[PDB]
Design a protein around this ligand. Structure first.
Ligand code: YSK
Ligand code: ZN
Ligand code: ZN
Length: 232
């Protein structure tokens, strides 16, 4: 009833939306992985009379539920989606999107890693993002490649109209006590990549992590701190 929805408040298979700013929502879903349940976030950005989706809801059935929740709460069609890295919490559900008329996009690096891992593969490649510090416009957002962090391919997303920074899984929530799932991470490079985010988006007002509660710019320094300590 108004607070940001937490892992224990969302059964696996349901999706909730949360209004972040005018024309900007996050989507929250839950999934089981290796015998534990986790929440995960994505983004929805109004694009005139259409919507841009950032990340799936972590699975085919959750992503179908996401589309139904968007129709109920917003009522505008999702026409494009971007996946910010290759893991299943970002691309799982791309096939559902593609069958619902959504054009799916990711960097070439994400597409090659998703294919090699056996995950669902976005249709279209996003060029111009292969060197750290690169940025491109995509509808109402800017896509930014900060360098290797949670994964080598991770992208962050900025909504300039609202100064919303969606960090994806390169950014952790303030309550986090470790660096999450580090299977594909570069712990040594991650603080440098976070510093690039901090330098490029100093006017961010809301920062959304890939899992957990949004906050302010402090999430970036907190992420650097937990990553350095995990590595140690
Ligand atoms: C292989 C491979 N599969 C995956 C994905 C699908 C995956 C599965 C299960 C869990 C996660 C997490 C995760 C874990 C713990 C915390 C709490 S915390 C910051 O306090 O430790 C958290 F916030 C997030 C992440 C992420 O860190 O992005 N990804 C995950 N990744 O690699
Ligand atoms: Zn991941
Ligand atoms: Zn993640």
């Amino acid at each position: 009833s108004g607070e940001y929805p937490t892992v224990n408040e969302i059964p696996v298979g349901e999706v909730r939306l949360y209004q972040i700013a005018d024309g900007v929502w996050s989507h929250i879903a839950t999934q089981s992985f290796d015998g534990a349940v986790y929440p995960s976030n994505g983004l929805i950005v109004r694009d005139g009379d259409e919507l841009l989706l950032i990340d799936t809801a972590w699975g085919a059935k959750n992503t179908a539920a996401l589309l139904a929740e968007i129709e109920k709460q917003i009522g505008l069609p999702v026409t494009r989606a971007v996946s910010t890295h290759f893991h299943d919490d970002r691309v799982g559900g791309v096939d559902v999107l593609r069958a619902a008329g959504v054009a799916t996009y990711a960097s070439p690096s994400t597409r090659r890693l998703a294919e090699a891992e056996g995950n669902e593969i976005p249709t279209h490649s996003l060029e111009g993002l292969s060197s750290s510090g690169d940025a491109v416009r995509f509808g109402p957002v800017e896509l930014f490649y900060p360098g290797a962090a949670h994964s080598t391919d991770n992208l962050v997303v900025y909504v300039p109209s609202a100064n919303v920074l969606y960090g994806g899984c390169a950014v952790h929530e303030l309550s986090s006590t470790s660096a999450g799932n580090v299977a594909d991470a570069d712990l040594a490079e991650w603080p440098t990549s976070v510093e690039r985010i901090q330098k490029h988006y100093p006017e961010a007002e809301v920062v959304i992590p890939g899992h957990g509660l949004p906050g302010g710019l402090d999430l970036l320094q907190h992420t650097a701190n937990v990553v350095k300590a995990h590595k140690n």
